[PDB]
Design a protein around this ligand. Structure first.
Ligand SMILES: O[C@@H]1[C@@H](O)[C@H](O)OC[C@H]1O
Ligand SMILES: O[C@@H]1[C@@H](O)[C@H](O)OC[C@H]1O
Ligand SMILES: O[C@@H]1[C@@H](O)[C@H](O)OC[C@H]1O
Ligand SMILES: O[C@@H]1[C@@H](O)[C@H](O)OC[C@H]1O
Ligand SMILES: O[C@@H]1[C@@H](O)[C@H](O)OC[C@H]1O
Ligand SMILES: O[C@@H]1[C@@H](O)[C@H](O)OC[C@H]1O
Ligand SMILES: O[C@@H]1[C@@H](O)[C@H](O)OC[C@H]1O
Ligand SMILES: O[C@@H]1[C@@H](O)[C@H](O)OC[C@H]1O
Ligand SMILES: O[C@@H]1[C@@H](O)[C@H](O)OC[C@H]1O
Ligand SMILES: [Ca+2]
Ligand SMILES: [Ca+2]
Ligand SMILES: [Ca+2]
Ligand SMILES: [Zn+2]
Ligand SMILES: [Zn+2]
Ligand SMILES: [Zn+2]
Ligand SMILES: [Zn+2]
Ligand SMILES: [Zn+2]
Ligand SMILES: [Zn+2]
Ligand SMILES: [Zn+2]
Length: 316
């Protein structure tokens, strides 16, 4: 909509106050004109028609319970935009400042959130398995990172390539959570999963086995469920990424940690320059090694730590 750029205030799903960029024309709309071609957040009104109505509010104050998922979808899309621009010089998910559109209140009791190829879609959850999923910055950034992948490597969503696709989204979801440095961790979805249970999450990058996911290639799932285990086998790559950043000794292999920023630079270069739609784990290792070589030199600690981490998870 055409209007004046304004700044509203509200509370997100977890009850935290934040400012949001809006546009004023009779109503205040969840339309942020400060980032690329815009960030636009819509009300799906418990239906499955997309995108729904551009979110309108009479007073620029977003403190109602019904507002909270919209506040977070809008704000965390902004954080994700800022991460990719400021850290990686990438303008929106396509690198060409595509508008970022999100719909909240999708369906009823819907325990999922997804990038659908052109926008984000957030369920409200059923209140037991999940609360509204836009409350999780790592979920928001995980799904928007699928769009980054689609516009770069084009990793296929099945078998080893699909597990890489999911790990890339977990890695950057987590790096965005740290960039936004409110309550970061190496867990996925902890803020919105199981409101009745403290200390759990959908999966752990630091210790995949805590939830029964593999932390070594020898433990990879080879069945047909989950598109060949894409959210299961991601644990192998997630653990490697965790080790690259934080270090540790895993199955007897010592890894010297190089920190989050270098992890992000190495994997971003691997994704955008070297991965292809069918890259397997071994090819990801090679891409990460080459990316660290490009950035830091073949004799660098960074290259050595990449190799150590992939060794530790059994990926040659
Ligand atoms: O849509 C308009 C946008 O294009 C401009 O950049 O800022 C004001 C908005 O109304
Ligand atoms: O506690 C939250 C509240 O502050 C917000 O306004 O609506 C959603 C709730 O979860
Ligand atoms: O376009 C909107 C539609 O998506 C929603 O489901 O019902 C109201 C309409 O304004
Ligand atoms: O409070 C309202 C809620 O009861 C309804 O479901 O949708 C709009 C909200 O503002
Ligand atoms: O235009 C392409 C689009 O069709 C696809 O969704 O992602 C890659 C883009 O280059
Ligand atoms: O250390 C920062 C890291 O926490 C963030 O995730 O990505 C950028 C780095 O500068
Ligand atoms: O506690 C168990 C854990 O040790 C294993 O790694 O995965 C399944 C869990 O039930
Ligand atoms: O069966 C597949 C397995 O061969 C591969 O290693 O990882 C993905 C699985 O789907
Ligand atoms: O096979 C790829 C290789 O061509 C490149 O050099 O590094 C990335 C690898 O995945
Ligand atoms: Ca209001
Ligand atoms: Ca997290
Ligand atoms: Ca929980
Ligand atoms: Zn998903
Ligand atoms: Zn995913
Ligand atoms: Zn967290
Ligand atoms: Zn899955
Ligand atoms: Zn998923
Ligand atoms: Zn270990
Ligand atoms: Zn460990």
């Amino acid at each position: 909509i055409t209007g004046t750029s304004t700044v509203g205030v509200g509370r997100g799903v977890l009850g935290d106050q934040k400012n949001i960029n809006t546009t004023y024309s009779t109503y205040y709309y969840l339309q942020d004109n400060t980032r690329g071609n815009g960030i636009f957040t819509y009300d799906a009104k418990y239906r499955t028609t997309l995108p729904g109505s551009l979110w309108a509010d009479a007073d620029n104050q977003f403190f109602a319970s019904y507002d909270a998922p919209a506040v977070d979808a809008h704000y965390y899309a902004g954080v994700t935009y800022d991460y990719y621009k400021n850290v990686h010089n990438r303008l929106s998910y396509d690198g060409n400042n595509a508008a970022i559109r999100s719909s909240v209140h999708y369906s009823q009791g819907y325990n999922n959130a997804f990038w659908n190829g052109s926008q984000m879609v957030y369920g409200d959850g059923d209140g037991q398995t999940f609360i509204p999923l836009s409350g999780g910055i790592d979920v928001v950034a995980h799904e928007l990172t699928h769009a980054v992948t689609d516009y770069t490597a084009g990793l296929i969503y099945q078998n080893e390539s699909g597990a890489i696709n999911e790990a890339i989204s977990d890695i950057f979801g987590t790096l965005v959570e740290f960039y936004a440095n409110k309550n970061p961790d190496w867990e996925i979805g902890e803020d919105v999963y199981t409101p009745g249970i403290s200390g759990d999450s959908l999966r752990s990058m630091s210790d995949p086995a805590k939830y029964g996911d593999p932390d070594h290639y020898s433990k990879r799932y080879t069945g047909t469920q989950d598109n060949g285990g894409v959210h299961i086998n991601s644990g192998i790559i997630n653990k490697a990424a965790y080790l690259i950043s934080q270090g540790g000794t895993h199955y007897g292999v010592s890894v010297v940690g190089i920190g989050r920023d270098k992890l992000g630079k190495i994997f971003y270069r691997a994704l955008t320059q070297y991965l292809t739609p069918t890259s397997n784990f071994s090819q990801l290792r090679a891409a990460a090694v080459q990316s660290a070589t490009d950035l830091y030199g073949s004799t660098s600690q960074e290259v050595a730590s990449v190799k150590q981490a992939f060794d530790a998870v059994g990926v040659k």
